[PDB]
């Protein structure tokens, strides 16, 4: 009922300007904020309190500090996030980089 009330207000703010946004985007942010069991804030004390990779979390507000908690809690970085692949200068698993590509020895001889 909280998820519901939150969308109702967000939508009332988009309509306060008098503009239109497709349900999905809002329902997405809204469900992101609720999944955690309650109403989770959108600030340094909100998302930067999550289980997510230390390198991702350090890219917003609490840098040196979260890195000190990484070195203190011997934190492990899964390298499955955007920010963490961006810092490492690699092909992030987003869009184009979600799947993988391989050649088939069989098909290579079939076509010729």
């Amino acid at each position: 009922a909280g998820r519901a009330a939150l969308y109702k207000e967000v939508y009332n703010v988009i309509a306060s300007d008098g503009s239109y946004v497709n349900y999905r985007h809002m329902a997405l942010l809204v469900d992101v904020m609720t999944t955690q069991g309650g109403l989770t804030s959108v600030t340094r004390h909100g998302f930067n309190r999550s289980n997510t990779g230390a390198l991702m979390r350090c890219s917003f507000e609490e840098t040196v500090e979260i890195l000190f908690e990484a070195g203190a809690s011997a934190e492990l970085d899964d390298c499955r996030g955007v920010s963490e692949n961006v810092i490492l200068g690699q092909m992030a698993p987003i869009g184009t980089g979600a799947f993988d590509v391989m050649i088939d020895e069989e098909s290579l001889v079939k076509y010729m």
Binding site: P93, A98, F99, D100, V101, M102, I103, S107, Y111, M112
Partner: protein, 87 residues
């Protein structure tokens, strides 16, 4: 684990090729065509590797296999020939 290789039977992934997929297959295939890779489709007077790759995907003569990764760790291996390029 390599057990995570989902059989060629049972595939929850869509039979169609995604925009991200066709763009990477074509990109990589054109990049190889420029590294002077062999061209399977007969070049109807084609100079541009992108166009060569486009005809290669049209004649389904590309030898590429897309390894789609399922969130848990799992994967479903699909061919360029296997996928539908309706789009």
């Amino acid at each position: 684990l390599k057990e995570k290789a989902i059989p060629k039977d049972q595939r929850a992934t869509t039979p169609y090729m995604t925009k991200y997929e066709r763009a990477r297959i074509l990109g990589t295939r054109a990049l190889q065509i420029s590294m002077n890779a062999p061209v399977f489709v007969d070049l109807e007077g084609e100079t541009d590797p992108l166009r060569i790759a486009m005809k290669e995907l049209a004649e389904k003569k590309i030898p590429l296999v897309i390894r789609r990764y399922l969130p848990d760790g799992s994967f479903e291996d699909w061919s360029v020939e296997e996928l539908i390029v309706d789009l």
